[PDB]
Chain A
């Protein structure tokens, strides 16, 4: 059951160098028909292939990036890696681990890129990680004698993207809506997460939101 998972930092400084690792699950990285590759997508823009690599260390490299791309296959630990030197802002993208199904000697994409990781966001800035302040958003005094009411969390001043919010340590997922984050003039982010609950089950169940900002090693639980 071939699945793929990227690992890698989320923030890197300009000029520095980027290090990514894809782990393969459900199949051997030695499949004679597999050309493991990297595709990236600048936010807002289109896909770009970076390079591919066979289980032998044979490496196919995109010409725009050949000068500063390196790849390797850890046959021992069933994974492949990417390295990109001298990052610039223009290197900010989602980076996707992928399997090109092809055939030897060099048909490294013959049957298409048919299985993808789901991306690691990479963000190239000189700015420093920032943990979000979290403030509770208390439910309304809404008068629907049945109806509902809405409570939430304001995840205030963080960087870089992403932030994940659960409710009730994962237990509450019905009717939760977490909103795309806004980018402020300061360069910092904020977002909000709102839950639609019964205004009946108001004083009984106690609602806590769980704000996982991994780039800053932060967890906050509020209310």
Chain B
């Protein structure tokens, strides 16, 4: 038994969003709505069909009509970007959750990434390893491409890059790691971290000095 729920809903700020959820046993059982923000416990925002727990803003309201229930979030805010889960139960009284809907607040200020590049520490070099560390923060929207350069020549092997991740405020962060031999760190003039966000490309760059 399955509750069906759109994967994504997108909404202009101050406007009103609709998350629907359908399942053949909603005639038998109430719906419940939980809000989940990155890395965090879900939060009940609607119990039974339309009851709002205490500290939940009035802009959340629940509605039913047949084999569909809906969360309605009046006047969407940036904080409301989250994952929303409907929850009910099958013919027997077995709890079941929908798939969840990402709510994206569109029209958010474009923000360019802030980039920080570290050479391999001496401590790590004398362990016979050299890892360059490129830290990419405070960007929106949440997509970057990252390019590593030995002098001005592109580099292919030994590069890992995280997926972005919705950070504390409503922005994103990511990070890329270049693994080298301690030879390689020494036998070039410069290594570069190039991150392309939207149109921009910002490039920090490090050299063996000392």
Contacts and interface: CB of A to CB of B under 8 A. Distances in A.
A110 B162 CA distance: 41
B131 A47 contact: no
Interface in A183-221: 183-185, 190-192, 194
A111 B32 CA distance: 9
A114 B52 CA distance: 11
Contacts of A48: 97
A202 B203 CA distance: 26
Contacts of B96: 49
Given A118-B41, A182-B175, A190-B177, A49 B121 contact: no
A19 B123 CA distance: 40
Interface in B47-80: 47-48, 53
Contacts of A135: 120-121, 123-124
B95 A49 contact: yes
A192 B95 contact: no
B192 interface: no
Contact of A150 (B40, B42, B94, B116): B116
A130 interface: no
A52 B177 CA distance: 44
B205 to A, nearest CB: 12
Interface string B95-120: 11111100000000000000010101
Interface residues of A, number: 45
Interface in A23-46: 37, 39, 46
Contacts of A80: none
Contact of B131 (A119, A138, A154, A181): A154
Nearest to B45: A112
Interface string A53-84: 00000001011000000000000000000000
The size bracket of the interface on B is 35 or more
Given A46-B98, A47-B34, A118-B40, A192 B93 contact: no
B181 to A, nearest CB: 16
A113 B48 contact: no
Given A62-B94, A137-B133, A179-B162, A112 B47 contact: yes
A206 B118 CA distance: 19
Contact of A114 (B53, B116, B133): B53
Nearest to B138: A177
Contacts of B124: 135, 154, 156
A154 B173 contact: no
Contacts of A137: 118, 121, 133
A180 interface: yes
Nearest to A180: B165
B121 A177 contact: no
A179 B173 contact: yes
A115 to B, nearest CB: 8
A177 B173 contact: yes
Contact of A117 (B41, B53, B121, B173): B41
Contacts of A109: 32, 89, 93, 95
Given A154-B121, A192-B135, A46 B100 contact: yes
Interface of B: 32, 34, 40-44, 46-48, 53, 85, 87, 89, 93-100, 116, 118, 120-121, 123-124, 127, 131, 133, 135, 137, 160-163, 165, 173-175, 177
Interface of A: 37, 39, 46-49, 52, 60, 62-63, 96, 106-114, 116-119, 133, 135-138, 150, 152, 154, 156, 177, 179-185, 190-192, 194
